[PDB]
Amino acid sequence: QQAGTETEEYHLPLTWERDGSSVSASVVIDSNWRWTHSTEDTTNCYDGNEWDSTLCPDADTCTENCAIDGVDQGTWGDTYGITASGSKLTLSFVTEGEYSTDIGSRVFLMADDDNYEIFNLLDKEFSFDVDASNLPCGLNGALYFVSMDEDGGTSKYSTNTAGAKYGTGYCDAQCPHDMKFIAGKANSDGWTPSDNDQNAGTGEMGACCHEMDIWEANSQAQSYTAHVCSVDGYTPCTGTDCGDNGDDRYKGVCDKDGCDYAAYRLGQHDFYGEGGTVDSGSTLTVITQFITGGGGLNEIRRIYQQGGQTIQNAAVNFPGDVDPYDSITEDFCVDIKRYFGDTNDFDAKGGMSGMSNALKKGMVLVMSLWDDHYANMLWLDATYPVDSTEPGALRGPCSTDSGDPADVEANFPGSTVTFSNIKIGPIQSYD
Ligand SMILES: OC[C@H]1O[C@@H](S[C@H]2[C@H](O)[C@@H](O)[C@H](O)O[C@@H]2CO)[C@H](O)[C@@H](O)[C@@H]1O
Numbered sequence: 191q192q193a194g195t196e197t198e199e200y201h202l203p204l205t206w207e208r209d210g211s212s213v214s215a216s217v218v219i220d221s222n223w224r225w226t227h228s229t230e231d232t233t234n235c236y237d238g239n240e241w242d243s244t245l246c247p248d249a250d251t252c253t254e255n256c257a258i259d260g261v262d263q264g265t266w267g268d269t270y271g272i273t274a275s276g277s278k279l280t281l282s283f284v285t286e287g288e289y290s291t292d293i294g295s296r297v298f299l300m301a302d303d304d305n306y307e308i309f310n311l312l313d314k315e316f317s318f319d320v321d322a323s324n325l326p327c328g329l330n331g332a333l334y335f336v337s338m339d340e341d342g343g344t345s346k347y348s349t350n351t352a353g354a355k356y357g358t359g360y361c362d363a364q365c366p367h368d369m370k371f372i373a374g375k376a377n378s379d380g381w382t383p384s385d386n387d388q389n390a391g392t393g394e395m396g397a398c399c400h401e402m403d404i405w406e407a408n409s410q411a412q413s414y415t416a417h418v419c420s421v422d423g424y425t426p427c428t429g430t431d432c433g434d435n436g437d438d439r440y441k442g443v444c445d446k447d448g449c450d451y452a453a454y455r456l457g458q459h460d461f462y463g464e465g466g467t468v469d470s471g472s473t474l475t476v477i478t479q480f481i482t483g484g485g486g487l488n489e490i491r492r493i494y495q496q497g498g499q500t501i502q503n504a505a506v507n508f509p510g511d512v513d514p515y516d517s518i519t520e521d522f523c524v525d526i527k528r529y530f531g532d533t534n535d536f537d538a539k540g541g542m543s544g545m546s547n548a549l550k551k552g553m554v555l556v557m558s559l560w561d562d563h564y565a566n567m568l569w570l571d572a573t574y575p576v577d578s579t580e581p582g583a584l585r586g587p588c589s590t591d592s593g594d595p596a597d598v599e600a601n602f603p604g605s606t607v608t609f610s611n612i613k614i615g616p617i618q619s620y621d
């Protein structure tokens with residue numbers, strides 16, 4: 191995409207801590223949330239769930255004709271419901287303005303005006319605080335890393351002159367088709383409006399890359415998940431390479447399921463939740479350690495703190511069936527997927543060693559708040575598939591009838607998440 195010139199871009203300031211030093215940085219909104227308009231007029235190129243066919247009769251013409259504009263200081267709050275102070279960021283769910291309603295948001299951490307911060311997680315400990323108390327069933331306040339390009343794609347894709355400054359270049363291990371710009375071009379060819387999301391659709395291409403989920407959660411359930419792909423960084427896909435949901439799920443370039451560590455799914459139902467060992471009614475500290483040895487990454491450990499108290503990760507609780515693993519390791523991934531009867535695409539795509547190489551190349555930090563128009567967040571917090579009760583189907587305490595976006599957007603529009611005190615540094619000991 192080209193950048194529009196109606197509104198100077200403002201990145202929302204955010205402080206964090208890197209290797210013992212305070213860093214005065216900022217966040218940027220993902221290009222998918224921006225005003226996309228004619229290069230010569232205020233006419234929208236994209237509105238609602240469809241492109242304007244006069245501006246966008248084909249992808250190349252759309253790319254020539256359309257531009258993504260800036261988000262000014264006031265618009266963060268008034269349109270997207272996003273605020274920051276010090277090292278604290280709050281994202282909102284439903285925000286209604288004079289003219290429009292926004293649902294959720296996705297932001298990236300910047301290094302400077304034109305480049306994302308690049309995290310090299312190997313042999314490091316990454317921590318933050320989160321308040322998930324205002325996230326019901328069907329919501330996800332997420333913090334994660336993806337193998338996006340540092341510059342958002344400007345060096346790779348000459349038609350992307352907007353770049354990381356405008357939040358371009360999102361990819362993840364879902365190979366999403368809902369991206370409006372992929373590979374520097376409008377993804378307008380083959381566009382189909384969503385069945386149930388008035389603001390979204392899908393185009394022919396998807397945007398794939400490795401993904402390390404630190405925190406996918408609401409007040410009822412939480413997980414952390416490693417997803418490896420067989421492709422090198424940001425990779426557009428078409429056709430079966432995208433591994434689309436349904437029949438193609440295991441045929442593409444990325445591992446959609448990932449190797450997940452989700453305490454409730456692992457038989458530890460009282461560990462996290464309202465009044466749990468880790469009480470989701472109160473802010474908590476989430477600590478993640480990327481342990482390496484001669485084989486590269488070999489373990490992803492989790493520690494919590496709450497109220498000053500260290501709380502070790504809850505171990506797998508299927509006595510006699512699965513060993514009491516308490517972290518992501520290769521053996522865990524293999525054994526748990528056998529017990530759950532899940533296809534091990536994680537290993538097919540390179541396993542822990544592939545994941546290690548992905549982390550070595552660096553990742554971009556993402557924070558988001560969303561509902562799930564495909565699967566109602568049931569994979570996170572309910573039973574999924576809804577018609578199974580085999581081990582691994584149960585994910586959390588929420589109903590199989592929960593999480594429809596038309597329910598949650600109407601019944602809990604005021605949902606929010608707050609992330610704070612983001613930090614990276616050497617691996618610490620917790621006794
Ligand atoms: O929908 C986004 C979510 O997908 C999961 S994979 C998920 C599948 O939806 C389900 O078919 C499979 O059987 O269970 C898993 C849940 O672990 C992905 O892991 C996650 O990181 C992503 O945000």
Ligand SMILES: [Ca+2]
Nearest residue numbers: 617618619620
């Ligand atoms: Ca210490």
